[model samples]
Target chain A: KQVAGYYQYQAGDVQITALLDGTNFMSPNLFKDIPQQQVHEILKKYYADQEKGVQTSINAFLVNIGKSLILIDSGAASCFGSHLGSVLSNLKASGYQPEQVDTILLTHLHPDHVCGISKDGVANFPNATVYVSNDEASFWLDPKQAAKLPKEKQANYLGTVEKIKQAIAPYQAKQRFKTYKLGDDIQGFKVINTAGHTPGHFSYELKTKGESIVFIGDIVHSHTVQFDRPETAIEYDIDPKKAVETRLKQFANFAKNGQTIAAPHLPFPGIGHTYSADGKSYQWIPIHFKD
Target chain B: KQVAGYYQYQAGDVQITALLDGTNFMSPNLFKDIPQQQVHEILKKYYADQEKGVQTSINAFLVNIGKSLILIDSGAASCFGSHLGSVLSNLKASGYQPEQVDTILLTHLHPDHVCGISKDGVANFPNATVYVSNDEASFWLDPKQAAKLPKEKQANYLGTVEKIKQAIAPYQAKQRFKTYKLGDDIQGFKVINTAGHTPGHFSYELKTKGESIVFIGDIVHSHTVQFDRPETAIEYDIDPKKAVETRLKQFANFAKNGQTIAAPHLPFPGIGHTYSADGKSYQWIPIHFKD
Candidate 1:
C-alpha cells in the first residue's frame, strides 16, 4: 500500500509532511554481535517477542512554514544501488514537484539521511536554499572521517557526502546554504542537539503556538529493539556508547516534555511521544492520524 | 537468545522471566477498515517495517515473587496447531519448567494470551493454581460473546478457555480458585485498569520497595502501529473506544510521572516508558538493557 505521511500540516500556511524513502531489513545478523540472551532480555523488557530480523526505515520530513517548502532531511538518494528508494514516489504522492521545495534542512548526513540531497552529483532541489547544522556539515564532509569509514560504507559515505556537497555547493556560494548553529531557532525550526549518533546530529523542534513536534534523526534504529534496549548498540553508530547515552537522554527528555517526535529513521510517518519509565528507560509512543 | 528481565528485588524477591511462544506475521490487510494510507501511515510512524510480514511474537511473562512462581498470562499455547507456539522452548530457555510454575495469573482469556496456559486441552502447568480475572470469566464464559465470534476465532477462544477452565476446575470445586481485584496490589503487583482491549484486560505493575515495573497488557496491539497511533483500534478489542481511552490515559500517566513499563505487545522484551501527548495520545520510549 502507499504511505500517507505525505499530508502536510500547516501553521497558518506552514506545511509539514513526512516523505517515505523506503525501508530495509538489515538481516538477523544485524544483532549478531550482541548476545542472544541480552537481546532476548531487551526484547522481553520492551516490545516483547521480537527476535531474529531487525527492521529500519529511512524517511525525509518535508516542512513548509509559510515562505518556503523545507525538506527536513534528504533520504538515501542514490546510494542504495538498485535496491530500494521510495522517497521520490512518496514525494510525488504528496503532490510535490522538485522545483517546489524552498529549503533543505538536514539532521545528519548518513546515507539514508542525506543521500537524497542530490542525484548524479548535482543538487536535486535546485530552486531552494539548503540549511544544515554547521557541525553536521563539518563532520560528514570531513575528509578524515570519510576516509576512515569501511570500504563499503566508505564508498557510500563519500558518495553521499560528495552529493551533499554538490547539492549545496551553489547555495553555499550564493550564501543560500545556511549552516545554522545547533540549538538556535532557524526559519521556523528550533534546532536541538541529539548528537552521538553522529558528531553533529541535530534534531529540529518545530513549534508554532503551543503545538510542537521534534524531528529525531538517527537517535535510534530498529525501533523495536532500540527503544527497549537503548543501551544496546546498533552497527550503524560511529560511537555505540554515545549513541546509547544520547538516545536514553533524548528519550528521557521527550518523555518528560511529552513532545511529538518525528524520527527520520523510523519506518515511515514516524511521529509520537516517549513513554516515560519512572527513573528507568522510556518507550516510544507512535502517533497515528485517523481520517 | 535467552530473554532477559528477571531482576531479584528484596521485597519478596520479584523475578520476571519472559517466556516466548513464537513469532508470526500479520497480513497487510490486518487493519481491515483502516485506509491503506492510514495503515501505512500508522505502520511507518511506529517503524513497523515488516516487508516479509508484520511480525508478532506471543509472550508469557513468568514472575516469581518469593511467595509464588506466578505466570502472568501465557503465550499462545502450542495447541493452536501453528508454529507460533514455542513458549515451552523459551520457557526452558529461561530456565523454567512447567512444573516449577506454582501459580498462574491471567490478564484475560484471548487465544494468544491464554492458549499457552494449556496444551491439547490440558494444563501445561499441571501443578499450578491458575487464576483468571473475575471479569474475564464472566465475559468469556458468557454464551453471548462466544456465539458472536467468527467460527475460527470462536473455536480458538472457546477451546483454549475450556481447557484452562478444566485445568483449574478442580481448584474451583475445591474453593482454590482465587479472584483478585483488578487494580489492587497483589502483594508487589498492582493491577492497573487497562481495559478495552478486552473486557477484563488489565496490566500488572510489579513493584518492590520503591522500584516499580508495570506489565502492560494488550492496551495496544502490536506496539509498532498502536504506539504510533494510539487511537487506531485493534480489531479484537471488545470496546475499541474505551480501550483507546484507557491506553491514552494510562500511558499518559506513566509518561508524565516516570514509570517503567513492560509491554506485552510493544516489541520483544517489551519494557519501556510511554511518552504522553494531548488527551488520548502517547508514545513508547524503550529502555536499554545491555546484553
Candidate 2:
C-alpha cells in the first residue's frame, strides 16, 4: 500500500538521498575464508534468518552539493534482474527527476554500479555525464584484458564487460563518459583509490561544511559480517586479499576519523559512522532518520 | 530536495508502515538518576554528538491486516510544533489514504499519540473508530483528575488533558472514540496494560503468521540510554519507579520472545528487535531496509 525505498539525509550543507536498489540474499558459501557455518553464526548473531541467507542491501546515493546533482554508485538495472532494478523508480519517488542528475560517479565499472546509467541503449539521465576511475576503465574496457584473466573467469568477465559497455555506450556516444585519476576531484568530490574488490574500485569523498561523507562503493558488503570481522572478504572481490586489506585500512581510518559513510552494499540509507570499541571489531551506527 | 519519512515493514501476514513524525533532541537533563557526565559518555561511545543532546525520533505506525487498516500512536500534529507533524504527509506519500484507515489504536492519550487523529475538530481518518485503554481514558478524562496530581504538576497535566480532549473531540462527537479493558481484543490486537509512562498507557501485540509485532507505546523512551540501562527513567514518566519496572519487565520479555517491535519513540521507523547478551543490558537490531 506504500512506497518506502528512499531516505533523505543532510550532512552540513549537502543533501543526500539514499535510494535502495533491492535486497539480495547471497549464499553463505560466497564468503571467502569463512566457513558457511561461521557465516550462518554471524548471521544468527545479527538476528538474520539463515534460511534467508546473507541479506545485503544494494543502495545508491544521489548527493545534492548545491551546484550539481551527483550520483554515486548506480544500482543494478536489468543486467541483474527485475528484482534488482528499482533505483530509477526509487530516485523518482524520492522527488527528483533522473535528468536533474548532472554527474554520475561510479565507484567502479561493475554492472551494478554502471547499468543503472542507461536502459535500451539510451541514457537514463540524458543530461548527465558518467565518470569512473581511469584504471577501472582500462581494466574492463581494454580489448586484451579478458585474455589475461584465467580461462574460467574470462567468460564471466567478458559477459560483465558487455553489460558495462552497453551501460556506458549512450553516454559515451554523447561524449559524456569520462574518467578520473586518484588525485582528481570532480565537482568537489575527491576520488580515493579504494581498489581491491575490483582492480580499480574506488570511493568518493565529499567534504561539506560540517562533515566529510564518503560514498564507499563495495569496499565492504554485509554490515553484519564484514563489519564484525573486517578480515573477511567476499567472492566478488577480484583480489580478495587486497580487498580485505583495503577494507581494513579504510575501516580503521573511518573508525578513527569520524567521517560519515554512505555505502552501496550496506543497509539502505547506509549513512552512518563506524565505531570500534577495541579497534578490532566494528559497529555501524546508522544516522537517525530525520524528517 | 526529497521527502524521506516512511518505511514499510512486513510481519507475516500484516504489513506495517512506519511513519516518521520527526526527530527531537531532548535535554540530557531529562534522564533522571543518571549523572550528566555519564550520559555524555554514553552518547560519545555511541558516536552521538553530545552538542546535539540526546536525539530521539517521534514515529507512528500504520498497520494493514487485510481486512482493516489500523493506525497506532498518531503523531504530534501541531500539538508540539512544525518540526514534529510529518506523520500525515509521510503517510500520504507512502500511498495510503486517510479514509482507508478503519481503526486507530492509541497506546496513550498523550498529545503525540492523539493529536494526529484529528485537526481543528475534524477527524483525519473519517471512517476510523478510535480506541484507548479504559484506564487511560478514565485517568485523563476524569474532571477531577487534575486536582489529584501534585500541585506543581497539576497545571501541566491539565494542559495536556485539554490538548488530548481537543484531539479526540470529533471522534467522540461521532461516538467512534471508545475504550478497551485488559484482555479485550480489537481487530486481532491484544491490549496489554503497560502503564507507567501514563496512568493508562498500554501496548498492543499483533500475532501474524511470520512474526509477532508489539506496538510498544512509551514503556521506554530511548533506545541508547534506556536500552543500555533499562532502569533509567525519564522525567516525563508519571511514576518513574513503575515506568522503570515496566520497561525492565517488557525489555526482558521482548528480548526473550524475539518479537519485532514497532515503537512510537526510539528512532524513525522504530520497528526492530531487542537483543540481550547477559539479560542485563540490551541492544536494538533495526531491520535492514528492503526495496
Candidate 3:
C-alpha cells in the first residue's frame, strides 16, 4: 500500500517523474464505432478484464530541466470523486516540493487535467503559474460554446465548466493563470495544436539533448483498444471524428519519427514509444522499467 | 534517484510486490543462432539501445497471501558486486518487514536468485525458512557434477557453487533450510518441474481469487529476443538444448492458458500475459501500470 505511483525516467539530460493520479474505468460502450462485442474481443486478446470494461490511468508528468521545474496536466482532485486526486501527493513523494514547480503546462482544462492545481480554492502549487492554451480557456470559459452542443449534453458541459472555473479561481485571482498562443514556448516546451479531444487540446514537445519527447494530453485513451484499432474514438472526445483523425496522423508520424511519448491517459509513468509493424495497427511499447 | 524499484500488484485477494534488484546487459552474442547484426536490427525496431547490447532486469517477488508473506527468489545481494542485491531493502520499503516473510521460495540455486537471503554470513530475513527444489540442491551440491562439465567450465561452476553454499549456510545452520520434491506443495504454492535453465530449475504456481500466476524462474532471460525466438538458447543454461525446449513448451502453455506470469528477468514488476497469434512467435504483454 505504500508503493508510490511515481516513476523516474531520464530522457537525455531532462529528468521526468511520472506521477500517478489513479485509475478510471470507462465502460466499453464509451467507445464509439466499435461494437461492445468487438471491444470485448480486443480485451480478450490482451487478456484484460473482458467484462469489467476499459481501464485507463490518470497520469500527470513532472519535468525537471536544469533551471526549471514544470508539471504538465494536473490530475482530478475530488472533481469526479475520490478515485483520483493523488497527483499532488505523488509529485511530492517523487522528491519534489510543490513550491519548486514554477510552471504548469496543462494540455487542456479537463477536470482531470485542471482541478489538481487547487483544492477548495487554494492553489496546490502556490509558486507556479498555470498555463493553458488561449483556445482552451475560450472554449471552456466561454458560456456561448456550451449552447452549440446538443441540448441534453449542455448540462454536463456546464457542470465541467463550473469545476474548471472553480479550479482556476485562485490562480486567476493572483493573475498567475496565463494563456498561451499556438506559437508560444514555455520553459523550452513547444506547443502543438493537437485539438480535437477538446476544442483547444494541445500537446507539448521538448528536446533534451538529442531526445525528443511529446507530453501528449489525452490524444487517445485505452492504449489497448485504441492502439489496436486506431480509428476507435471515445465518448469523452469533443469531436470523435477529428479525434480519430488526429490520433492516426500523430501515430503515423510518431511511428516514423520515433519520438518518445509521454501520455497522460496511457498507463502510469505513461512513457513509451509507438510501433506499427503493419503500418495499419500500432502497439504501445512501454519503456523498460528502470531503477 | 531515491525512487525504489518496487511495484505492488494484486491478483485476487493476494498482493504481489515485484522488487527490482537491478538491470544487467547481455552481449547480443549470448543469443545462439541469431547474428549480432540482426540483433541490432531488432533492437533498432524496438527503439532500444541498438548498440548497448540487450537489457535485462533482475526481479524478485514478494507474495502476500493474507496469512503469510512469501518471498520468491532472493536477489544477488553483494554476490555479484554492488549493482544488484536490493531485494531486502525494497521489501522493507514496500511496507512489509523482512521478518514477516515466513516462507522463502527459491526457483533455483543461481547466485542472483539466492544470495539476497543473506549478507556477510547472516540471514537478512531472520524468521524465514528457505526452500529449494531437491533436484536443484542435488545438482548444485553434488561434487561429481562439476567434473562432468568441460575443464574450462568447471572453474566457473565451482565459483557459483561456492556462492550458493555461503548464501544458504545461515539458514541451513538454523535448520530453516529445507528441500521439496516434485508434486510437493509448500505454503499453498504448487511446484512445477521446469528444469532446463539448470538441471533442477522449477517454477511455482499459486491460485488466488481464480487468478493463476506462475513464478517462472530464469527459464528465459531476455523478454524480447527469447520470446520472439523461443528456440534461441542462452549461454548460462547447463543444457542449452533442453533449456530451449523447456521455453518452447512453457511459452506455448502460457500463451494458450493466459495465466499471469511473474518473471525474474522480463522487466520490473515483471508480471504480465504472454500472447502468440500464430502459435510460432510470442509477445510479452506487460500489466498496465496501476496506482
Candidate 4:
C-alpha cells in the first residue's frame, strides 16, 4: 500500500517536502457567513458530495535550505482526533528525524499548527530554534485572552495556551524562542501579513536566487470552493469579512506576479501557481510529478 | 525525500495498490493524428509546458484477493530510460515479494507491459502463472510476425517476442501459461476488449461484493490532453482511428454508469470517476483521500 507521507519540490537550491499530517472533518457550516446549501452547491460544481461537510488535509512542510533543516508548521498531535496527529509518523516516513530539525517557523498559534511542537507536554524537536510572529505570540501566550473566551471554549483555549508554553518553555529559557514582524527575514524567510483568519495570521515567503515560493497557511481551506469564490470564509476565521479581503488581494498578487505557493490545507503536494480565471475567479494548477 | 511508490484503494473485499513504475518522456509528435500546434494548445489548457511534448507515468497494480496475490502489468525493466524501471523497487516498497505473487495478469503484450516479467533472459516471478488474452498471445508470440517488421522496427519487435517467450517459457513447460477470451473470468478477473491502442489491447474489471473497479490500460496517456479531447491519439497506437473510437465509447460508459476507473497513465493515485460534460466532453473527478 502507498504510505501517506510527503512530496518533494525544488525551488532553486532549496529542497521542499510537503509532509501530510492527516485529514480533519468539518461541518458544512464552516462558512460563517454563507448558507449550508450554497456551500454544497459550490462543492457540487467540482463534483464533490457535500453530505459530510468538508474533509480537509493537515499538511506541514520541511525545508532543507543549505545545511539547515527548517519546519514551517507542526501538525495537530493527539489533540485533534484519531484521523489526525499523524505528522510525527509521516515526518519519520519522509526520512527526517525530529532531532535533526534546526529551526521551526510557525504560521500562527492555532493548535493544529502548534500542537505537534510538544508531545506529552514536552518539546518534540530538541535542537530547533522556534520562530513565532510577535502578534501571534501575544495572542496565544496571554492569560487574559483565555479568560475572555466563553466557558465552553475556555478549555480549548487554555489547552492551546498550555501546549504553546510547554513547547517554548525550554527554548525561551535558552533565549532561542524568537519573535518576528512583518518584512522581517529569518534566514531568507520573509513574513507577509495575511491576518484575519486569526487576528495575527501571517504567511511566510522563501526566496533563493530568482526563484521563490510562499507558504499561505490556512488562507483558504477548500481549494475548489475558495478559488472559485474568494469571498467565502470559514467559521474558524476570527474576522470573516477581513479574511475574504485578504484572500482576494493575496490571490491577485500571486497571479499577477506568477508566484509559486504552498498551501497546507490544499490537496497533497500542494505546491502550484494560481491563475486568474474568467472574471474574479481563480484556478489552482497543481505541480506535475515528473520524477 | 518523498518516495514515489504505491497508493492503496479498496474495491469491496479486494484491496488494490497502484505502484508507480516511473515516468517516460515523449515529444509533441507522439500524437500522429494531431497537429503539434494543436497539441501544445491543449497542453496549455492544463498548465503544462508544451515546449517538449509531455512526460507521462507508467503504473501497474497489485491486487489482494482474499488468500491470493495477483499482479497486473509489469513495467519497463531497463527498457525505456533511466527514469523508468522502478516498479520492482516500488513493489517491494509496497510490501510484496515477487515470489508471493501467485498470478500475473497482462493488459497487453507491449514491451513496456511485459518486459518486466523477465530479466537477463529469465522469468522474474518464478512461481506465478502468467495469463494473456488469446488474441494478444497470438499477435505477440508469433515468430513470423517478427520477421515481417521493417529493419528499423525489427530489433524492437524481436526483443518483445523474445521477452514474452522467456517470461512464459518455464510456466508454459509446466502448462501454467494460460490464455483466455472475452468474458473469461480468471479468479474473478474478467477481460474487456479495449483494442485499438494495440491490435490486441485489453482491459480488466474486478468485482467483489457490490463494489468494483476497472483497469483502463493506456486508454489515455495524458489525462489533461485526452480528457479534454478524446479524439487525440498517440503515435504508438497501431490503429489511431480505432483507438479514438474506443476511447470515446469507454469514457461514455464510465460516465453513464458512474464507474470508478484506474487508469495507468493518469496522475498518481489515478482512481476517479468520469462525468459527462457537454456534447462530447467529459470531466475527471479524482477520489478524495480520507483516512
Candidate 5:
C-alpha cells in the first residue's frame, strides 16, 4: 500500500519535520487507575465514538539549524521487537536521509523513545553524538536504584538502559557522552526541569534571535483533558503528585509567556498554546498554520 | 532525563492516546507557493512566532475495540532514519505493550504516517495486520507509475512501498493480505474514499451505534491551516486541488452532522470538530477533555 510519512514546515531559520516513527494500540482504561467515567467524559466531547474507543498517532521531529540536525527523540527501533520503527522511512519521505542527522537530544531515554538510538547494538546515527539530561540517565541507569526497583519497574529501567548502552557503546568508548542541565543551553537551547513523571524528566527551550518554543516532552498526556484539568494524574506516574506539580508549574510558565508548546504527545504537528482558563485550569489554543 | 512520550485518554470504548513520535522544523517557504497574506492572517491570530522558524509535530493515535487493538496510522520511524517511531515507546509509557496490537488501519502510506510498518525488513507489530485503501496501494505501488513520478514524489512513493513490502511481505505470502474500498469499513467502521492528495487517499467514518467520528488522514496536514480555512492547501499535497474538494465536503458533513473529528494532526489527542463560520468558511472547536 502507499505509505505516507513525513512533512516539514519552516519558520525562519528553524526547519522542523514531523517524522513518522510507528504506532501502538491499547484500551480506554489505558489511563492506569484513572476511572473510565472520567476519561470517557473527556473523550465524548471531542472523539468520534466515546462508547467504542479511540486511536492516537505518534510523531517525532527533526529540528535543523545551520549544521546541527537536532533530533528531539529517537523513535522505536525496528532492531527490537515489532509495533514501530518508521522514522527512517518517513525521513526519506520528507526529503531527508538518516546519515544527515548530526545530533540527537533526548527528552528522556525510555526504550521506545530511545530504542532507535542503535541498530542491532550499533549506533543508528553513526556521526551523531547522543545527549541526555544527566539526572534522567542517573535515575534509570543507576545500578543501586535498578536493584531496588520492583520487578516490573526494574525490568523497565534495565531494558531501556541496556538499549542505550548497546547503542552508545561506541560513544562511551570514545568518552563522547553528552548531557545538559536544566536551564542550561549546552547546544544553544535551555532546559526545564519537568520532573515527577521521572526523577530527571526535563523539557527544553529553544530560542533563536527573538523567537522561542518549549519542547515539553510529556507534561500532559491528553491535551483535551490536561489543558482543561492539569490536576488529573496518571497511575504509571512514578509520582503522580510530582507530575501534577511539574505540570502546574510548566503550565503557569507557558500560559504567562503565551509560548507555543512543542508537544511530543499533542497530536502530530502538536504545536500550540495553553490558555489558562482558571487558576489551575487551562485551555489549549493551537498555533495553526494558515491556509 | 525522564522521558515522557504521549498521553492517553479513555473516551468510553474509544481509547485515544497522544503518542509523541516527534516534530519537524521547517522554513517560512514551507508554505511558499500558498498565499502568505491569507495564511498569515490566521497564523497571526494564533500568535505563532515564526521568527525562528516553523516547527510541526506529527502525531498518530491508537484506538481500541472488542478484542481489537487498532492503530490509526504508523508514525515516522527514526530507527530507520527519520526522527520518529516513538509510538510503541509512548504506548508502553501509557501502559501498552506491542504484543497487544491486532489490526492497523492506515489513512495512507506516507513515511510519516506509515514508515512504522517495518524496521530493517521486519514488521514492527509482531502480529498486527495492516489495512489500507486498495486504490492507494494499487496506484502508489505501481512501479511504472512510480518511475514516472517526479524525483521527490518517486522517492516518497518508493520509500513508502518499500516499507509496506517489508511489513506485509510475509502476510501476502501467506495469503493474509487485505485491502479494502475507500468507503468500506472492516466491521462497523466505514472507510470514506476522501481522495485528492493521493488517488486512493481516504478518511474513515468510524460509526459505533448512534455515535461516530471520522479519522481525517492527511485530508488536512496542519489543523491550523486546514480547519480554519479548509481551502488553504499545502505544498506537499499530491493533488492540492482535489484534496481541497474532499476537505470541503468532509468539513460540511462534519459541521452539519456534527460528526466528531479524530484528526491525526489536531493538537495532542487530536480530536475536535468544525463549525461553519462565514461565507463557506469554518472555525475549529477543539475538544477539551475535562471532568
Candidate 6:
C-alpha cells in the first residue's frame, strides 16, 4: 500500500528493480503526423480519455549485475514540477542509498531522463561514473545546434541544454563524466544503438546463464497504438520515420526471438515481451510477478 | 524494492487502493471448452509463454468512501500455498491494520476469495462484519451438496467448505457473519449479481458523486482469450453457459457506458475499462497510474 512503487524482477544472476517516478499527462498532439481523429479513436479504443490528455508513466531502472549497481535514466526530480519526482524516494524504498549506485547510464539527454542525476547543485550518486553517448553529449552540450533552431524551438533547446549542463558540470570536472561507443560492453551489459528517439539514444541487454533481457529505451511511447501499429511515431522523435523503422524492426526481432524487454513507458514494472501477429503487427504481454 | 504492491486511484470522492496478493499459475486446460491449440495460440498472441503455465494475478481493493473503510476480497492465505497469502501484509503496507477494516464484503466463496478471512484458526479482520450472498453461504455451507459432488471433486468441495466455516464460525456466533440479498446496498456499495462463475458469485459497484466503478468478480478468467472470444469458458465456472451469458452481457454494458471495472484476475491493480469495437468484440484498457 505504499504510494511509492518499487518492483523487482530477476533474470538469472541480474537483479533488476523498476522505480516508478510517477506519471505525467500530456496533450494527444504528442504525435506529429498522425491525424487527430485517428489518434483520438486509438485513445478511445485503449480507454484513454481523449479530452483529458494522454497519461505517460515515468520509470527508471536499478540493476545489480553481480558486483556493480547501475541505474539507467535517473527520473525528472522537481524539473517537471509536482505529481512527479518519486524516483529517489522509490530507490530509497528499494533499500539502497544514492551513494551505493556505482554507475549511472543515461539512455538519452532528455530532461525527463537526466534531471534526477542531480538536485540543487550536487550529483545525487556521488560514487557513480556517469555514462552517456558521445553523439548525445555533442548534440545537447553543444550550443551551435541550439542557435540554428527556430526561435520558438531555440528556447526549449537551450533551456534543456542548460539544465543538463548544470547537472553534469560538477561531475565533468571530477573526470566522472564518460562517453561510450554505440556497442560498448560495460560490465555485464552490452549497449544497443537505438538512436531515432534522439540523436544518440541507446538501449542495453543483460545476458546471464543463457537468459537475456533488453532495456528498450523509448521505442514505444504508447503501448496501445504503437504495438498494433508500429508505424505510428511521436512528435518528440527527432526522426519520426527512423523511429518507426527502428521500432518495427526491434519489435519484429524481439517477437521472433521471444526476447523479454524492459520498456520505460509500457506500464508499471514495465517488463514484458512483444509478439508479432503477422510478422508486422505486434502485441504486448506483461511479465508475471514472482516471489 | 518492496514486493508488496500499493496503487491508488481517485474517482471523485472515492479513493481506492488495489492490494496485490501475488499470482497463481494454472494449466491452459483451465478453459473447459476451448481447443488447446487455439488457447495456446491466443496466449502466445498475448506474449504469454505456452510452455510455461498461464499466470493470473490475485488482487483485492481497499476503498475509502467518505468516512468508512471497506475491503473487497481477502487473499488466499495458507489455503492456496507458498505462492500466495500476501494480501494481509500488503494491506499493512497500504497503511492500515486489520482492525481498521470496518466492512469485509466477499465476492464469492472460492478458496482464493474467502480463505484470508481467518488464519491459524482466528478471524483475520476481528473488527469487521463479514458479508456474503445468502445463496453463496447456503451453497457452500450445505454438507449435502458437498456429499453429492463427485469423489474427485468432493475433497476440494469439503476443503473449501471447512475453510469458509472455520473463518466465519466465530463471527457467525457473534452476529458478524451476515448474508445479504442480491441488490442490497450495504454501507456505500451496491451488490450486482454476476453468478454462474460460482453458484452465487457477485460483483459490486461503488459510486461517488458522478463517478462509478464496478468490481467485476471473475467475469473473465484469462483476459487474453476471453476478450477476443467471450465464448471461452474456464473449468472453474459452475455453469459454463450462464457464465458466458453473464460475461457477455456485463462486458457489453460496461463498454457501452464506458464504465471502469476492478477485476480480480486481469493483472496487478486490475482496474480498467472495456471498449466495444465494431459493436461486437471487446478490448481492455488499464487505467493510467495517478498520484
Q: Assess every candidate by TM-score.
A: 0.50, 0.95, 0.98, 0.91, 0.55, 0.94
Locate the minimum summed-lDDT window of 10 residues in model 3 chain B: B42-51
lDDT (Cα, tens digit) per residue for candidate 2, span A110-219: 88889999887788999999999899999999999878989989999999999999999888899999998879989999999998999999999999886899998999
Q: Evaluated with TM-score, which candidate comes out highest?
A: 3
Alpha carbon deviation, residue A244, candidate 2 (Å): 0.8
Model 2 DockQ class? medium
Model 4 agreement with the true structure over B1-291: per-residue lDDT tens digits: 656578777777788887787876687778766677777866665567534558677888889998888888888876666677777788888888988888888888876787677775567788888888888898887778877766877787787677677656777876778899887888788888998887788888887776568888877887666777778888777678898899999998987776678877776666777766563877666665554
Question: Is 1 or 6 the stronger prediction by DockQ?
Answer: 6
Better of 1 and 5 by TM-score: 5
RMSD of 5: 14.1
Clashes of each: 60, 1, 0, 1, 93, 1
Which candidate gets the maximum DockQ versus the true structure?
3
lDDT of 4 by residue, A200-232 (tens): 888998887776789999889976678877888
Candidate 4 at B171: error in angstroms?
3.2
Per-residue lDDT for B1-291 in model 5, tens only? Answer: 112445555555666665666656555455634676766655654565366555566677776776777777877775345566776677777677766777777888677777665566666777778788888888767778877778877776776677666666765665655789744667456788888877888777777655677888877766555656777777767888888888888888887787667766665456667766353877567653221
* Candidate 4 ranges beyond 4 A from true positions: A1-4, A32-38, A41-53, A146-159, B33-35, B50-53, B146-159, B289-291
DockQ of each: 0.03, 0.60, 0.70, 0.47, 0.04, 0.58
What's the lDDT for residue B183 in model 6? 62
Tell me candidate 5's TM-score on chain B: 0.88
TM score of chain A per candidate: 0.84, 0.98, 0.98, 0.92, 0.88, 0.95
- Better candidate by DockQ, 2 or 6: 2
The best-first sequence of candidates by DockQ reads 3, 2, 6, 4, 5, 1
List model 1 lDDT by residue over A190-235, tens digit each. Answer: 8888778778888888786656778888888755666655676777
lDDT of 1 at B179: 70
For each candidate in the order shown, give its overall lDDT on alpha carbons.
Answer: 0.66, 0.88, 0.89, 0.79, 0.68, 0.82
- Most accurate candidate by lDDT: 3
- DockQ, 0 to 1 scale, candidate 1: 0.03
Better of 4 and 5 by TM-score: 4
Model 3, C-alpha of B270: deviation from truth (Å):
0.6
Encode model 6's per-residue lDDT on A139-199: one tens digit a residue. Answer: 8888689776678777878878888987788789789999999768877778888888888
